[model samples]
Target: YRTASDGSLNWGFRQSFRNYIQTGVAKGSITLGDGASDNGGNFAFTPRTNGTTVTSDSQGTVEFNGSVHFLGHQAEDKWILDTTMSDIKMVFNGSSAQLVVDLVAREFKGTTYDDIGEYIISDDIVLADVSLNSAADFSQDSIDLSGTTDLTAAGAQAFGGFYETGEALDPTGGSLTISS
Candidate 1:
């Protein structure tokens, strides 16, 4: 048997009936990625320039061009080059930011790292040279994924490229610009 509501659904999978009946919960957030209820297929970043560099000494800008992949995996993904939005930006202050999965960004930031919580911009949501594994920029400002789509592992890997351990940098004024 199963149970679900109009806005959401919860499913449980157990190895055996007498084995405590293990269960799992999958929330909804325009779900995209491989093995996901919603998928963006495969996304790519389209940059307006050629060199993968940034000048943040004063004010630097780069287009976050890419396609959003839903229900996809590695190797099949790529960055388009450049892209952007406007207004209503989110700024990461370093001291207050949480990087969790699912749940809610605001809620996730307040809560601790539990198993079934959401994700917040705990630190600077930096995007480095994912391919070459080098530093990019963002010493002045950083983009916080708060109020934005909560990142899935597949989505993060696809959007920001394969991040190294300490490649992501912390900017002074982290924020986002949403046009619409």
Candidate 2:
């Protein structure tokens, strides 16, 4: 038996958003926070916390570091979509999981933008649904868990509404090591 000591979480967020910036209308850029890396396509974040206990029953939360800034629909100093996601965390329970994150995004609707400012969205926000390929075992030293990610309602605002509810985002895959 063991508790989590250290690990990392990797995800690409969404590919369509990148495509919009690459070939579609919203042409934008993605900036990575320190300690985060762009692994060709996905972003890999370091673990900030050791996380909760994970046994055969499968449980606990793992916190990850770093932020990814997405800037699109730019106009002068302002933007129709300027969002940043940080403090990523993965929660597991009863064979299911959720990807939680903190989002600071500017809202945009129709042609004109909201005169207001940004939204600091946090707490109980599941950015995506994480599905594990296999059960988690605490006895193992290293676990390679990977699965697909789906956008949640709370997640749509994370990108300033560039993507809607129930959108298919990039998959999340990582190898985490646990210690006794």
Candidate 3:
């Protein structure tokens, strides 16, 4: 195996290994022998280019064309594959990423928002009960209510507590007084 000017290994002879070409035992580094001087036994290696796929026996194939490094123990099945330079990261342990954030967009598993802004869901969101403490501007938006929607004096006092349930309250019994 000869080294290239671009810090990549060029193999003149085809050789297959049952395991891996390792440096030291217990804890060491893997070398690609890309011509350049060995930097602490570590060498620069590019797994794929353009749109190539890296296949595995038990695990699924990863189709990527970027910088990546897989760390952790393979025997215990505790591995963390990190595509450090890639914008979108997909971690596969047990549960996948529910939320994905990148330079272009932030995506959720359930809902997808268009622009970059704050969202306030006053009613039920997904599962269970949730409330927002901050002043959420659902001003121009419409809310769908079911059955009896109760409004308390302490809750949403800016809107109003009591509303016109039946027609309008008859205030012509005697003197009419409006108190603030």
Candidate 4:
């Protein structure tokens, strides 16, 4: 495995969810941290290349350095729903790939957000299934792979059904690239 060197994963998360928090008594904001950037409608999670290396069709994991906080639905000083995702990772095993993210969230009470209720957080959760355009190959100094993604069952459950199993997320044509 060689150091990723550099790369990025741009994801829009859920369009409806992004728009949902602005309705009724809802008010929201999306914040980014570390190397994560706001790319208009989507967020760009930059790779944490120094932590590991990349291999050709071998099993390994690489993480992104950014974090994002989604807060929505208002009730005075509390939100009905709030979630934070960080320490993003894309793991490749055999010929398949999965995305893992650290999740921290509070309960969503239909129209409004939560503040006084119990919340949940996770260490590492497989969030999505990534269909790599092609299998992992490290023959070249640089690598570029494109594919789509879908919500995993566990991913759907993590967000309390914000998305459904196999539901498509934005920036459908996702790519993974590493530079020398």
Which has the higher lDDT value, candidate number 1 or candidate number 2? 2
lDDT, candidate 4, 1-103, per-residue tens: 4666666777767666667654423468877899888776567777675755555545567677899887766567776667888888878754467778899
TM-score order of candidates, best first? 2, 4, 1, 3
Model 3 accuracy (lDDT, Cα): 0.18
Q: Write the per-residue lDDT of candidate 2 for residues 1-180, one digit (tens) a residue.
A: 465566667787877777776567877888899578888757888766544545454676667778888877766677666778787787876446788887777655565543535656565678998777766555657655587777888787655575788888888887678776
Report the lDDT of model 1 for residue 127.
24
Q: Whose TM-score is greatest here?
A: 2
Cα error, residue 51 of model 4, in Å, equals 2.4
Write the residue-wise lDDT of candidate 3 on 95-165 in tens digits: 11110112211111121222222222222111111121221111212111111112223222211122322
Off by over 4 Å in 1: 1-24, 31-41, 48-62, 66-104, 109-124, 127-180
Instruction: Kindly report which residue stretches of model 3 are placed more than 4 angstroms away from their true locations once superposed.
Output: 1-65, 80-180
Clashes of 4: 6
TM-score for candidate 2: 0.83
| Candidate with better lDDT, 2 vs 4 | 2
> Taking the tens digit of each residue's C-alpha lDDT, what string does model 1 give over 91-133?
1223332221221122212112222222323233332211111
Instruction: For model 4, give the RMSD to the true fold.
Output: 2.9
